[model samples]
Target chain A: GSNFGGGGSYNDFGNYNNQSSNFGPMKGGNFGGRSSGPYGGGGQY
Target chain B: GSNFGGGGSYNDFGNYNNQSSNFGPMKGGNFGGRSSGPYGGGGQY
Candidate 1:
């Protein structure tokens, strides 16, 4: 049985995409009295 | 002439990602208090 097997890995093109942030300036949460505001802390940790 | 042609664009794999903030617990700033002792301790009359 001679059949064209679909077993080939095609090299993909450049998938470069400009990433975005769904989390913009987060609301200033609860800080004690006389405190500065919150900033985008790059929450990655 | 039988030749293979790159004519089909296949669906790409998931590029789902995420993002976050660049801020964290900031330094506690100054709180001016102008008064006697500045500690409000029990003063003897």
Candidate 2:
């Protein structure tokens, strides 16, 4: 499967692939897999 | 409506409010609203 908007990979089932960084609250600086904004929080992926 | 992550505001239709920063592709350093990385790119919101 290929990745979607973010670095998340998605298939028919909707799989999100997330990477790690150093910005926000999350390990990669994101809440979930997302960034540090309103609708840009960490994704459950 | 209230703001969600990434300084984005959300409503019943799912609105994402993103703030501008100095980091990626878009203006705020994100492809969309995301931070930077694989699954941490900018969002459409």
Candidate 3:
């Protein structure tokens, strides 16, 4: 399974897990769906 | 039609299309962009 599934896909970001959900000031989620797997990574694997 | 534009507008809890990118947790979209143009309603007339 090369796909991360619904909960995991390529977001505006490159993390593949950091989703666009993280984009803003005081919050700093702007990484998009990248890095959710891990810093220099993207959250899910 | 007056305006069902730009994939619709007013995504700030005014009944347009559910935006804000945040604000609304659990994916509520905060009713920010309003409601795809059909709902109980909010700051919009």
DockQ of each: 0.03, 0.05, 0.04
- lDDT by residue (tens digit), candidate 1, B1-45: 332322343424333222233344422222221113223311211
- TM-score attained by chain A of model 1: 0.17
Q: Which order, best to worst by lDDT?
A: 3, 2, 1
Off by over 4 Å in 3: A1-10, A13-45, B1-18, B23-29, B32-45
Query: Model 3, residue A33: displacement in angstroms?
Result: 21
lDDT (Cα, 0-100) at B22 in candidate 1: 36
TM-score of each model, paired residue for residue: 0.18, 0.18, 0.15
Which of candidates 2 and 3 reaches a greater DockQ?
2
Off by over 4 Å in 2: A1-12, A21-28, A34-45, B1-45
Candidate ranking under DockQ, highest first, comes to: 2, 3, 1
lDDT of each: 0.27, 0.32, 0.37
Each candidate's fnat, listed in order, reads 0.01, 0.05, 0.00
What DockQ results for candidate 2?
0.05
For each candidate, give the TM-score of chain B: 0.22, 0.22, 0.15
lDDT of each residue in A1-45, candidate 3, tens digit only: 444334665454221232242112343334343233335743344
